[PDB]
């Protein structure tokens, strides 16, 4: 009974939370996935979403200034991490020296105009002093899921991906990765919000309470997010 717009980094997490949420509360979570920025437009245009799980905090804040949000509704549900990643175990070294030494032609990022995880990537390359040399090599996905898939499918040698896409059981579980240290970019604070069409909706209220709950908190951290 709850239409949720879900930033692509949070695709697998919400599919998992949706299964326990349905069983526990009886309300069905119907999720659309995509870039935070694309949902900003859809919401502005009348999309039926009732809850919005952003990959940032500024987009929910922007929507509230423009009257699309229930005041009092904004909270942080997860804090993400950026990783440089390749499915090839020898390719991305433990310190990220490939960004400086590598011979790759394609570096995958999510569209930084719509994807907070892409913005974190361009902040990190900028603070590394590598924006001018890596810029020509960039290939932009429409969201962090597409950016990841470019690397997984071999359309780019490596990419800046969401930790949630490669992390299981407290560990990067596949390929080779460098965890981007936070000082290189703004913390990836991911905020949730009840939208106008979710005001006074029982499933919407149940969901945000659930996201703050014990079963949701354990799943969220199992994908590498901090709370």
C-beta of 82: minimal distance to ligand NH4 in Å?
A: 12
C-beta of 140: minimal distance to ligand NH4 in Å?
A: 17
C-beta of 119: minimal distance to ligand NH4 in Å?
A: 9
| 20 versus 186: smaller Cβ distance to ligand NH4 | 186
C-beta of 188: minimal distance to ligand NH4 in Å?
A: 13
Q: How far, in Å, CA of 161 to CA of 159, rounded?
A: 6
| 58 versus 123: smaller Cβ distance to ligand NH4 | 123
Sign of CA dihedral 115, 117, 121, 127: positive
Interface positions with ligand NH4 (CB under 6 A): 123, 126-127, 182-183
If one counts every other C-beta atom within 10 angstroms of the C-beta of residue 24, the result is 13
Of the candidates 117, 121, 108, 118, which has an alpha carbon nearest to the alpha carbon of residue 155? 108
C-beta of 137: minimal distance to ligand NH4 in Å?
A: 18
| 64 versus 126: smaller Cβ distance to ligand NH4 | 126
Task: Retrieve residue 52's tokens.
Answer: 């919005």
Sign of CA dihedral 13, 161, 192, 11: negative
Burial level of 65, CB count in 10 A (0-12/13-18/19+)? exposed
| 4 versus 188: smaller Cβ distance to ligand NH4 | 188
Q: How far, in Å, CA of 186 to CA of 168, rounded?
A: 24
Exposure b/e, 175-212, CB count within 10 A at least 16 = b = bbbbbbeeebbeebbbbbbbbebbeebebbbbbbebbe
C-beta of 57: minimal distance to ligand NH4 in Å?
A: 17
| 76 versus 123: smaller Cβ distance to ligand NH4 | 123
| 82 versus 216: smaller Cβ distance to ligand NH4 | 82
Burial level of 76, CB count in 10 A (0-12/13-18/19+)? middle
Indicate the residue whose CB is closest to ligand NH4.
123
């Amino acid at each position: 009974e709850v239409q949720v717009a879900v930033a692509a980094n949070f695709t697998a997490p919400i599919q998992a939370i949706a299964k326990e949420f349905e069983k526990d509360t009886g309300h069905r979570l119907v999720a659309a996935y995509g870039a935070t920025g694309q949902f900003y437009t859809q919401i502005k245009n009348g999309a039926p979403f009732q809850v919005f799980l952003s990959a940032d905090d500024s987009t929910p804040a922007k929507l509230e200034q423009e009257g699309e949000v229930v005041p009092g509704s904004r909270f942080t549900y997860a804090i993400g991490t950026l990783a440089l990643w390749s499915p090839k175990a020898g390719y991305v070294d433990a310190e990220g020296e490939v960004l400086k030494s590598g011979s790759f032609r394609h570096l995958s990022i999510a569209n930084p105009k719509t994807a907070p995880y892409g913005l974190a990537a361009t902040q990190a390359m900028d603070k590394l002093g590598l924006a001018a040399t890596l810029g020509p090599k960039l290939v932009e996905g429409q969201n962090i899921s597409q950016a990841y898939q470019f690397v997984s499918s071999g359309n780019a040698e490596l990419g800046f991906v969401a930790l949630s896409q490669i992390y299981k059981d407290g560990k990067v579980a596949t390929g080779s990765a460098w965890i981007v240290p936070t000082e290189l970019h703004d913390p990836i604070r991911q905020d949730a919000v009840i939208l106008n069409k979710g005001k006074d909706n029982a499933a919407a209220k149940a969901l945000v309470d659930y996201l703050k709950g014990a079963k949701a908190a354990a799943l969220i951290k199992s994908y590498g997010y901090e709370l």
